[PDB]
Each structure stands twice: as structure tokens, then as C-alpha cells.
Amino acid sequence: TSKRRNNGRSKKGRGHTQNVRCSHCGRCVPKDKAIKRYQIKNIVEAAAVRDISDNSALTKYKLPKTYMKLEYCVSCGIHGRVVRVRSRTDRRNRL
Amino acid sequence: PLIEVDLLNPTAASEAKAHKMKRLVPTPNSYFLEIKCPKCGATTTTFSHAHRQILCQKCGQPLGQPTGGKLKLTQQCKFRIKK
Amino acid sequence: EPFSKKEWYNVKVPKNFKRRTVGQIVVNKTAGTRIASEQLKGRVVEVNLADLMENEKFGAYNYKFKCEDVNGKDCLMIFHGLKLTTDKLRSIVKKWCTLIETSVDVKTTDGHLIRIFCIGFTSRKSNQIKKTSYAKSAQIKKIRKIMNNLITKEAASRELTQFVDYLRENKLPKEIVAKCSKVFSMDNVYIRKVKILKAGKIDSLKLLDQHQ
RNA sequence: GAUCGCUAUAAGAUGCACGAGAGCGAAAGCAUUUCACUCAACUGUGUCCAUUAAUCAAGAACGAAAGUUAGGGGAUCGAAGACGAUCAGAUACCGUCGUAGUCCUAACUAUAAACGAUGUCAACCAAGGAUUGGAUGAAAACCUUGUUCAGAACUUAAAGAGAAAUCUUGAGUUUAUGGACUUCAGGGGGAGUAUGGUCACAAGGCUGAAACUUAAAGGAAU
RNA sequence: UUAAUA
């Protein structure tokens, strides 16, 4: 029956939550049920950082980063290896 | 509780910690006090948890402000507990 | 050849900034009923603030200017707006804190009508142990009303040109933090965008005062 | 003269990041900030009444989405439909276009995996750490701590229960069987079907069998 | 990308 005590959600004291769109499928998933991951990366890959820094017109300009929050449905979180299927006794670990 | 204490003779500290109703014999946490006026020498007796502006009987150096559970007496108002 | 008819004009920003020339802008040469000085009348130039001041402590601000006349191969610019750099705006949004946003419509002393946007964030404390730092709905409205009133006093009293140079000094963000700290712990206060809702009247002599 | 780039406009819709096992609400549900009008609850109380209470056939308000009626709006998406691919075929999945619809106002409809699949009220009840809103001491609104009231939760159990999964703010206190009240079920199908009654503009909703058929259908775990 | 049946 109940594979999870919380039913796979994060909703406890309410009846409805708004929807969000899967970043890969475009599916509609509720805000709590969606798999939310955060990403902070530089706009230049590790190979090209040296090339840009060589020929630059600015004194010591610091390369900016990009920040975006990605939300995945369950199907596209498992398939994209964002999350894995865990053991029956290891499902309970929340760290 | 697994460890148990006497239910007829609770300690003075234990009864003080408990809720005002959940004591052995329920007692109020409030009291009646009088406030000497900053302006004059008269003492006005009033409830501890008054729910209105407290004025002197002489003038009205307002002596207290009602704030959701206990009178907010002015910093210069001295009081004693009426027993 | 496509560039055979093209001309390059020098761009001049007002004297408020350390750097007076920011680049060159292209326009086709004149034609029958097409004058380049007439065509370079609605061009908006966007340049970083770390270039107009020649210091990189101003790098997270983009400034925009419009052209008001062509004074002999020179486009005399006037201030058109300012906006936080996209990387900076998204780098100051922490997760477990309350975000406070506001916008004010202020009429300057010299007649310009502008819109100013302010952002803020409830912060942690030195000895704070609990993870979250949220504010009640009462404290948010108190903070917003303070930063709404405080930003209006500093902006309405001064003209558009001197108010913009005031924004370069951190007095306003520092003063907001030092006046909303008696309600809640605030750390990051920035003016993310300034618009110009209604362009006030300008004169050539006033513009000449603005340009040397 | 597309895609692309800058600048300007005017409607529709939406309300990112903050946004959480956080809050509010009887449930459905509720997210730009300001001002009003309300409402509810918690806490505080040497304030008042004095049983006014609990659960409730009949009956009555609210009831997601879709759907219906009549105006306005008609951006995006898009049941139907039309193309192009894939395939043995593809009326589908993939791509392009696109009507009703999606949005607002007034009136219907009254159904959902409307779920915590766990009725409402009340008593007793093992160890914790944390959090939301108060009251109260200490430490100089914010924050760190002691106590206590209310709320959504979480962890441990060699204990209690259960067929087990699991439950512990109960699914415990039950063959050592009785705290109060209401609703529902009686092997699987036929079947929420036929007929009868009633509600609705309609789709449909509420009530609701029988003949016949069959030794299994089903639940949790290895 | 496609992969029906006993």
C-alpha cells in the first residue's frame, strides 16, 4: 500500500498548492511534489576561462555566474539521474 | 511521565511552573496592587492585568497602559503587592 | 558594399561621469529626406557604470542614455535609466529569508517624474541559531512604509542629475538599513531599477549646462 | 525582407526567484502592494450568563476541474478538426496550424484518487529535538535561553495493537469484549445496470433491484 | 528511431 508516509509530497496543513512546470518534460506538477534543484555555474566553461582572461579589455573584471532553479517531475527526475531509486530502508533518509 | 512525583504535595517551584489551571488547586497568577502617582502621593489600587488606561484618582498621570496580558506601568511608577 | 554609406559618431555623456566618451554609434549617411542628425534622435545607449566612473566597484549597474542632439559628430546624451546587472540581481536572493520589494513614483525638483524600485532582505544575526529568518506581515508593512517614505525624501528634494550622482554614494542604502534595523535585521538593500515615466521639459541651455 | 538586434506602444493573461513537510480556511481553496469593509481564531483576564451542551434521519448554505445559458474579452495554450512524420497499419505518442474552451460578469450544474482512502465530541497515555502564534522570567523589534497555552509536523521504542505493511497528537487503553451519537458493508459478477420516483435547459445527479452465472475474487508479506 | 503475438 502506502510506499511513503508523506505520500511523496511536502504538503501537510493545506489542501491545494499551485502547479509548476517540469523543466524538461513541461509537465504540470504541484509545487511541493516537484523535485527542486538549484544550479549556480559560471557563464564560461573551465576550458575557456583562460582564453577569455588572456585577451580582455577590462582591468580585473570578475566573471559572473548564472543562477537558476530547476524543477523536475518524478518521471524526468528519475530518468535524468537527478534522483535514484533507493533501498526500502534507505528511503527514510532525508539528509 | 515514567518517573512520578507525589500528587498531593507538589513543590513550590513545581506549582509555579504549571499552568494557572493545571495546579493542584487552581490559583490565579494575577494580583491587586496600588501605584503611587508620579505627580502626587496618592496610591491607586488596580488589577495587575488591567484592560484599560489607568488614571490617578487625583490627576491623570496615566499610570499604566493595557498590553495584552499585563499592565505596562510607566518606568517611574512604583508599586507594591496588596496582600 | 553595405558599409559604404555608414558614418560613425562620437558619444558624449554628461559631465557627471569621469569618462566622457563611451564609444561610437553607426548611422547611414544623409539622403534626400533623411538627415543623420535627425535619425540619431531616439537612440538609446546602454553602458555599465564601471566604465563611466573608471572604477570596478561600480560594476553591478547598467546605465542607459538617449541622444538629444547631434552637435557636430557628437551625440550629447542625457540620462535615461539605470538597472541592476542580471547576475547581481539573482545573486542576492537568499532562500530562507524574506524578500521586501517596493516602488515609488517621485516628482523631482526640476520637473522629471521617475519611478524607483527598491529591494531588501531580512538577514540573519551574529548569534542566530535557527535556520529561518522570516518576518511577520506586520513587520514587512512597517519596513516597506519606512523605505517608501525615506526614499521619497531623498529623491524629491534634489534634481534628477544630482539625485543620480547621489545613488552612486551608498548613503541611501546605508541609511535604509540603519533605519529599518529597529524593526528587523536587514543586510542587502539595493535600488534595482530607476525609470523615467514622464520626461520633464529640457532646454538647450540647460542641456549645455549638463554638457560642459 | 523572415529568424535576429534596439527603441516605442495598447489590450488579454499571469503573479518567477522569496516559497518551506511554513501560515489561513468547514471543505473546495487561498501568493504583485496599498486602502477600506468584514470574519475567524489563539493568548491574557478576581468580567458576565448559569447547562444554554455533543451527535444528528427530514431540511438548508458552500462545493476543484470539465460542461450549459447570455453578454464582454479573445494574448498563450488547446478536446474536435486539418496537415507532416514513424509504423505492417497509426484514426496515437513526435512536429505545425487550429474551432469550442481556457479569462470576467449573472445564472445553472453538484460531481473527483472531493484522500489522512482514517466520521464528530470527550478522558487517560513512553522518551525526545525542532518549528508557527501568544503569555510570562533572565539575558541589550531583531536574536539567545527557562516555563506554559494553542497549531501543522518529525524521530526512537525490547512496549500496546494488527493478517502484515504499519499506527503512537492512534489504527493504543477490546473475548479482561459497554464513554456519547450518526453514516455505511455482508463472496465475485450481473451493476450503480433495468424499471419506478424526483431534481436539471442538457449532459447528468439522488434513490435503486431482479433473473441468471460462478469456487473463488481479493489484502499484506516471503 | 523502430521491437506485435504464442
PDB file of C-alpha atoms (C1' of nucleotides) in Angstrom, chain D residues 93-188:
ATOM      1  C1'   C D  93       2.665   9.039 -28.867  1.00  0.00           C
ATOM      2  C1'   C D  94       6.706  13.449 -32.076  1.00  0.00           C
ATOM      3  C1'   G D  95       6.205  18.334 -35.081  1.00  0.00           C
ATOM      4  C1'   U D  96       2.930  22.711 -37.468  1.00  0.00           C
ATOM      5  C1'   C D  97      -1.753  25.142 -37.757  1.00  0.00           C
ATOM      6  C1'   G D  98      -6.185  25.493 -35.239  1.00  0.00           C
ATOM      7  C1'   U D  99     -12.611  25.835 -33.556  1.00  0.00           C
ATOM      8  C1'   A D 100     -15.305  25.161 -28.721  1.00  0.00           C
ATOM      9  C1'   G D 101     -12.770  26.131 -24.247  1.00  0.00           C
ATOM     10  C1'   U D 102      -9.188  28.468 -21.222  1.00  0.00           C
ATOM     11  C1'   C D 103     -10.367  34.858 -18.723  1.00  0.00           C
ATOM     12  C1'   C D 104     -14.536  38.457 -16.361  1.00  0.00           C
ATOM     13  C1'   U D 105     -19.927  39.269 -15.092  1.00  0.00           C
ATOM     14  C1'   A D 106     -25.029  36.950 -13.925  1.00  0.00           C
ATOM     15  C1'   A D 107     -27.499  32.165 -13.567  1.00  0.00           C
ATOM     16  C1'   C D 108     -27.275  26.653 -13.705  1.00  0.00           C
ATOM     17  C1'   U D 109     -24.800  22.000 -12.775  1.00  0.00           C
ATOM     18  C1'   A D 110     -23.431  19.299  -7.620  1.00  0.00           C
ATOM     19  C1'   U D 111     -19.574  15.560  -9.439  1.00  0.00           C
ATOM     20  C1'   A D 112     -13.439  13.956  -8.267  1.00  0.00           C
ATOM     21  C1'   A D 113      -7.887   9.080  -6.136  1.00  0.00           C
ATOM     22  C1'   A D 114     -13.589  15.813  -3.227  1.00  0.00           C
ATOM     23  C1'   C D 115      -7.590  11.121   0.151  1.00  0.00           C
ATOM     24  C1'   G D 116      -5.132  11.342   6.044  1.00  0.00           C
ATOM     25  C1'   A D 117      -8.697   6.101   1.093  1.00  0.00           C
ATOM     26  C1'   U D 118      -8.681   7.051   8.748  1.00  0.00           C
ATOM     27  C1'   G D 119     -16.760  10.362  10.854  1.00  0.00           C
ATOM     28  C1'   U D 120     -17.889  14.106  15.107  1.00  0.00           C
ATOM     29  C1'   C D 121     -17.232  15.003  20.545  1.00  0.00           C
ATOM     30  C1'   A D 122     -14.687  13.561  25.314  1.00  0.00           C
ATOM     31  C1'   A D 123     -10.908  11.118  29.092  1.00  0.00           C
ATOM     32  C1'   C D 124      -6.014   8.587  30.058  1.00  0.00           C
ATOM     33  C1'   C D 125      -1.444   7.971  27.590  1.00  0.00           C
ATOM     34  C1'   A D 126       6.597   6.057  26.898  1.00  0.00           C
ATOM     35  C1'   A D 127      11.425   9.166  25.562  1.00  0.00           C
ATOM     36  C1'   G D 128      12.872  13.312  22.733  1.00  0.00           C
ATOM     37  C1'   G D 129      14.763  17.599  19.234  1.00  0.00           C
ATOM     38  C1'   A D 130      12.813  21.409  16.210  1.00  0.00           C
ATOM     39  C1'   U D 131       9.117  24.873  14.288  1.00  0.00           C
ATOM     40  C1'   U D 132       4.485  28.683  13.801  1.00  0.00           C
ATOM     41  C1'   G D 133       1.472  32.465  17.096  1.00  0.00           C
ATOM     42  C1'   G D 134       0.907  34.246  22.129  1.00  0.00           C
ATOM     43  C1'   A D 135       1.701  34.982  27.652  1.00  0.00           C
ATOM     44  C1'   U D 136       5.497  35.068  31.370  1.00  0.00           C
ATOM     45  C1'   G D 137      11.191  35.430  33.898  1.00  0.00           C
ATOM     46  C1'   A D 138      16.500  36.114  32.512  1.00  0.00           C
ATOM     47  C1'   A D 139      19.991  37.943  29.196  1.00  0.00           C
ATOM     48  C1'   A D 140      20.678  44.589  25.476  1.00  0.00           C
ATOM     49  C1'   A D 141      11.639  44.847  17.116  1.00  0.00           C
ATOM     50  C1'   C D 142      15.642  41.589  15.803  1.00  0.00           C
ATOM     51  C1'   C D 143      18.410  37.258  18.365  1.00  0.00           C
ATOM     52  C1'   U D 144      19.897  33.537  22.511  1.00  0.00           C
ATOM     53  C1'   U D 145      17.554  30.753  26.761  1.00  0.00           C
ATOM     54  C1'   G D 146      13.636  28.835  31.270  1.00  0.00           C
ATOM     55  C1'   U D 147       8.248  27.850  31.883  1.00  0.00           C
ATOM     56  C1'   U D 148       3.458  27.476  29.959  1.00  0.00           C
ATOM     57  C1'   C D 149      -1.124  27.662  26.214  1.00  0.00           C
ATOM     58  C1'   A D 150      -2.755  26.683  21.098  1.00  0.00           C
ATOM     59  C1'   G D 151      -1.294  24.735  15.716  1.00  0.00           C
ATOM     60  C1'   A D 152       0.941  21.790  11.221  1.00  0.00           C
ATOM     61  C1'   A D 153       4.560  18.138  11.664  1.00  0.00           C
ATOM     62  C1'   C D 154       9.123  14.778  12.708  1.00  0.00           C
ATOM     63  C1'   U D 155      12.493  10.916  15.294  1.00  0.00           C
ATOM     64  C1'   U D 156      13.221   6.465  18.865  1.00  0.00           C
ATOM     65  C1'   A D 157      10.554   2.050  21.289  1.00  0.00           C
ATOM     66  C1'   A D 158      12.968  -4.554  23.882  1.00  0.00           C
ATOM     67  C1'   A D 159       6.063  -1.509  24.994  1.00  0.00           C
ATOM     68  C1'   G D 160       0.469  -1.623  23.234  1.00  0.00           C
ATOM     69  C1'   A D 161      -2.286  -3.177  18.581  1.00  0.00           C
ATOM     70  C1'   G D 162      -2.813  -5.536  13.968  1.00  0.00           C
ATOM     71  C1'   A D 163      -3.043 -10.732   8.880  1.00  0.00           C
ATOM     72  C1'   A D 164       1.020  -7.892   7.872  1.00  0.00           C
ATOM     73  C1'   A D 165       2.518  -3.381   5.757  1.00  0.00           C
ATOM     74  C1'   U D 166       2.489  -0.295   9.551  1.00  0.00           C
ATOM     75  C1'   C D 167      -0.155   3.072  13.665  1.00  0.00           C
ATOM     76  C1'   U D 168       1.884   6.027  18.607  1.00  0.00           C
ATOM     77  C1'   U D 169      -1.293  14.100  18.892  1.00  0.00           C
ATOM     78  C1'   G D 170      -3.571   6.226  17.486  1.00  0.00           C
ATOM     79  C1'   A D 171      -5.196   2.267  13.542  1.00  0.00           C
ATOM     80  C1'   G D 172      -3.356   2.142  21.816  1.00  0.00           C
ATOM     81  C1'   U D 173      -6.459   1.819  26.629  1.00  0.00           C
ATOM     82  C1'   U D 174     -11.245  -4.732  23.032  1.00  0.00           C
ATOM     83  C1'   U D 175     -13.027 -12.345  24.230  1.00  0.00           C
ATOM     84  C1'   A D 176     -10.130  -8.677  30.744  1.00  0.00           C
ATOM     85  C1'   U D 177     -15.484  -7.584  24.695  1.00  0.00           C
ATOM     86  C1'   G D 178     -20.264  -1.452  27.054  1.00  0.00           C
ATOM     87  C1'   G D 179     -17.818   6.795  27.203  1.00  0.00           C
ATOM     88  C1'   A D 180     -21.958   9.605  23.597  1.00  0.00           C
ATOM     89  C1'   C D 181     -24.169   9.898  18.555  1.00  0.00           C
ATOM     90  C1'   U D 182     -24.668   9.470  13.112  1.00  0.00           C
ATOM     91  C1'   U D 183     -23.419   7.019   8.292  1.00  0.00           C
ATOM     92  C1'   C D 184     -22.036   2.644   5.668  1.00  0.00           C
ATOM     93  C1'   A D 185     -20.638  -3.189   4.366  1.00  0.00           C
ATOM     94  C1'   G D 186     -22.087  -8.576   4.049  1.00  0.00           C
ATOM     95  C1'   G D 187     -18.119 -13.821  -1.561  1.00  0.00           C
ATOM     96  C1'   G D 188     -17.097 -12.203  -7.015  1.00  0.00           C
TER      97        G D 188
END
